[PDB]
Structures are given as structure tokens and as C-alpha cells.
């Protein structure tokens, strides 16, 4: 058997956990608890949008007690251990998929867009107390389309332990799309532009380039079918921290037609000819604008692979 | 195997508040107000 082998189990599966809970069942649930750990009544709408602090024993009231007949070993200690060990899958399967408390069902790891909201809510005192402090700075576990990432709030050192202070409602907690507080991990592939009388990024016409990607690092980021691709070009001021042009003044999708050695190559030809020239009429309307190229799967999925935000003539 | 061998295993009210609303006379046609207004 190879390393992709995986099996079902008795510890993170069903049939073990029974209809029981080590917490108190009452008629003021869960709002009494939300206020009791400091959530303001002005923002009680978030009581069902974000869980109790994973740092406190109350969070684990939802599960059958670890001593009762048939219960899984689930405690705030076992949670933190798996967290710092990097066993994020066991957290999803043992705890997250079976929280199901606070009358909310779509508990998930927060997205990058959701941590951004959590930082704003924490600073504005709209959360529980322990989380109003927690989401100010630190390294936080995020999850976008089944993929784990660590986002940084406040520029903390890279060796700060990963924090997952609370899980959030997948749809109930509204994310913020602007990148301000939670700074992500964008991937930049090593690529060569062949230039010469070929690649061209100068005002007055269409932008064309011909890059070249390496196969071994495409397979590391989930790109083994080297024709299941699509390209995006962005025009605007890139983000000062990550370098991506998240809200470009001009966005354009194009499809490639290339087919060499231990690497494979891909073209790119903007449609700036035989239509509005406006790519160059906006790319070169402001000296701080830059042009960036992004690679996705054919339907826009996959690990987003970014080129540098170039100046004129790929500088 | 000796007798110390052991393995994992697979094995070892609810009508609130809508029941109360009907009991003090709220009609089922307008039970949506049961959570909008408190008991008398």
C-alpha cells in the first residue's frame, strides 16, 4: 500500500457519540452563556455565529463526558495538542464535524475572509471576551476549499504557535473580502519570460508574453494535468504585503494555446487589439500601476499561482 | 494472543416552545409569533 491509503475509524466517526452532552441543558441556551463570557447584548446576533473559546472548558460542554459509556477522549488539552502538532484533519473530523452545538450546524474553520471579520469584531468588542483579545494578533488556522493556511494579524513572528481560538458558522459569520488584518500565504511560481522579439509589455498595444513552468513544482501544488489551466491578468496597485492585485482597476481572463523539455510552457496574449485599447490606456494612465499574471484551474479553482506585478517591459 | 488483548469498538423536553404556545391558546395558523412574543 502507498501513502495515500486512508481508512475509516472508530474514534473520529459516528456510532460512538450518543445523544448526550456534558453541559447543562436549559431554556436560556446558548445566549446566557454568551453573555456570561462577556459578549455584549448589543452584538448577541454573533452568539450563534462563533463558538465558545476553544481555550475554555465550556466549549467542550457539548460532547458526551469522557468518562461516560462510549465517549471519545475530547478535552481542551487534547484539542490544543492536536493543534500544535499540526493534526488539523483530526480536529476537523473529531471535533469540528461533531460540535453541532449552540443551535448551529455549519461549524467550520474560519476562512481568511472570516478571520478578517473576526479581527474587526474583536477590536470593536463584538465578541466574547476571550476572543475579543485573541483575534487582535497572532497566527490563525484558516481553511479555503479543503486547503489549510495560516494567516497573520499584526505581522507577528513566523514561529508563533498556530491559534484556532474558535470555529465559526460557514455562512452565518459574514467574511470581509478586503485584505487588511489577516495577511495570507500567496504562492509565486518560479517562471521564465523568454522576452526578446517575443514577450512585450509596453504602451500602445496588446500585451503578450510566453512563460515556462516546471513540472515538479506544479505537481507539488496540485497541477499534474498540465492542460487543465486558465489565466488571468490584473492591472493596478498590488498589495503592499503579499504583492497580489486583489482589486485591480482592470481584470482580464485569457486562454492559452501552448504545447517542451523537463518543463512545460504556456503563452498569453491579451485582447487589446481589435477592440478598446484600454488595457494600455489604464495600465499606463498611472505610474504606480503594475501588470500581474495569475494561473488557476480551468474553472478558476486550484492553488492560485502568481507572477510578479511587473512594471513596463517586465521590470 | 493472551487475555490482555483489547481493541477499539463502535459501541459501549423536545417540543419547546411551540407546545406551550398552543397550550395557552395560540392557533397553529399563526404559530410564527410564538418566538416573537413572550408568555403572558
Amino acid at each position: 500500500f502507498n501513502d495515500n491509503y486512508s481508512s475509516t475509524s472508530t474514534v473520529y466517526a459516528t456510532s460512538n457519540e450518543a445523544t448526550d452532552s456534558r453541559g447543562s441543558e436549559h431554556l436560556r441556551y446558548p445566549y446566557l452563556e454568551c453573555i456570561k463570557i462577556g459578549m455584549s447584548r448589543d452584538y448577541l446576533e454573533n452568539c450563534v455565529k462563533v463558538s465558545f473559546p476553544t481555550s475554555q472548558d465550556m466549549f467542550y460542554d457539548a460532547y458526551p463526558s469522557t468518562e461516560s459509556d462510549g465517549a471519545k477522549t475530547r478535552t481542551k488539552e487534547d484539542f490544543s495538542a492536536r493543534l500544535l502538532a499540526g493534526d488539523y484533519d483530526s480536529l476537523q473530523k473529531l471535533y469540528i464535524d461533531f460540535y453541532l452545538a449552540q443551535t448551529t450546524f455549519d461549524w467550520e474553520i474560519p476562512t481568511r475572509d472570516q478571520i478578517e471579520t473576526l479581527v474587526n469584531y474583536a477590536n470593536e468588542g463584538k465578541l466574547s471576551t476571550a476572543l475579543n483579545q485573541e483575534y487582535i494578533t497572532g497566527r490563525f488556522l484558516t481553511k479555503e476549499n479543503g486547503r489549510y493556511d495560516i494567516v497573520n494579524v499584526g505581522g507577528v513572528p513566523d514561529n508563533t504557535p498556530v491559534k484556532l481560538p474558535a470555529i465559526v458558522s460557514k455562512r452565518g459569520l459574514m467574511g470581509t473580502t478586503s485584505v487588511v488584518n489577516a495577511i495570507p500565504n500567496e504562492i509565486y511560481p518560479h517562471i521564465k519570460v523568454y522576452e526578446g522579439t517575443l514577450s512585450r509589455l509596453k504602451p500602445g498595444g496588446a500585451m503578450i508574453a510566453v512563460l515556462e513552468y516546471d513540472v515538479n513544482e506544479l505537481s507539488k501544488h496540485g497541477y499534474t494535468n498540465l492542460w487543465d489551466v486558465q489565466f488571468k491578468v490584473l492591472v493596478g496597485v498590488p498589495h503592499a504585503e503579499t504583492g497580489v492585485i486583489y482589486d485591480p482597476v482592470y481584470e482580464e481572463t485569457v486562454k492559452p494555446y501552448q504545447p517542451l523539455t523537463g518543463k512545460k510552457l504556456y503563452n498569453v496574449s491579451t485582447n487589446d487589439m481589435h477592440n478598446g485599447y484600454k488595457w494600455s490606456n489604464t495600465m499606463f494612465s498611472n505610474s504606480n500601476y503594475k501588470t500581474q499574471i495569475l494561473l488557476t484551474k480551468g474553472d478558476g479553482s486550484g492553488v492560485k499561482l502568481y507572477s510578479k506585478a511587473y512594471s513596463e517591459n517586465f521590470k | 494472543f493472551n487475555d490482555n488483548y483489547s481493541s477499539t469498538s463502535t459501541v459501549y423536553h423536545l417540543r419547546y416552545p411551540y407546545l406551550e404556545c398552543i397550550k395557552i391558546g395560540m392557533s397553529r395558523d399563526y404559530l410564527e409569533n410564538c418566538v416573537k412574543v413572550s408568555f403572558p
Binding site: - | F1, S6, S7, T8, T10, Y12
Partner: protein, 132 residues
């Protein structure tokens, strides 16, 4: 074979008789100067414990795992099988143990705790040969 003298391996289809008692198989008579060898290998098995009859090569009867109340349930999940054999005075004494999920078997009996001891739900092939 590689400087050692050997006899041809001969094969028998074996099951334990009900009652969970060890299986007695007679050792082959070895030529002068050679010693007995034995090996048991897994053919068919389930977690049925005593609720089975595998003595037919053509079909297998499996009635499920013994529950704590003595009734016959479904086949519990499996964790290990041990085949043990000892030669004592011209007789190979064969013992077996099937490891299944705990918390299903009764507290006492042939099938107890997490073990099906010398179960009928097992067919093994017995090979014998002689070597120096």
C-alpha cells in the same frame, strides 16, 4: 537446496473442531538425520468465533459474532489473527486466536473480551516438511 537437505512439502486442509480445543495434527515421519517443520497459513476466516463451520472447502458458514447476552449478531470488525504451533512427541499442537473489536464479546467463555479462541471461523493450510 542451498546445501540443506529437504523433503517435499505436503499440505492438509484443517479446521478446529467446535469446543475451542487445540487442534492435534500428527507430524510426518522424517528420514534419519532430518527434523520436523510445520507452517500454518490463512485460507478463509471471519469474526464469527464459535458460530461458524468452515470445514467445507467449497462453502463457508458464518453466523456472526457472539454478543454479551449469548445471542448471535453481525460480524464484528477484526484486528488480528495469531497462528501458533508447537511440536511435542510426534504431534503438532495448533492454537489460534482471532482479534476483533472489544466491547462486543461476553466477559467469559470461548469468545471473550477481544478474542475468538481456536474458532471454527478459520481455515488454515498446514504444510509439513523435513530439513537439517
Amino acid at each position: 537446496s542451498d546445501g540443506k537437505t529437504k523433503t517435499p512439502v505436503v499440505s492438509t486442509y484443517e479446521t478446529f473442531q467446535d469446543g475451542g480445543r487445540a487442534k492435534t495434527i500428527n507430524a510426518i515421519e522424517c528420514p534419519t538425520g532430518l527434523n520436523n517443520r510445520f507452517a500454518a497459513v490463512v485460507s478463509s476466516f471471519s469474526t464469527a468465533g464459535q458460530n461458524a463451520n468452515f470445514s467445507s472447502e467449497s462453502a463457508k458458514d458464518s453466523q456472526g459474532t457472539t454478543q454479551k447476552d449469548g445471542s448471535k449478531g453481525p460480524h464484528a470488525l477484526l484486528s488480528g489473527i495469531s497462528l501458533n504451533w508447537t511440536l511435542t512427541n510426534k504431534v503438532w499442537d495448533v492454537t489460534a486466536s482471532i482479534g476483533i473489536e472489544s466491547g462486543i464479546l461476553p466477559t467469559s467463555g470461548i469468545d471473550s473480551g477481544s478474542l475468538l479462541r481456536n474458532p471454527k471461523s478459520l481455515s488454515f493450510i498446514a504444510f509439513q516438511w523435513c530439513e537439517n
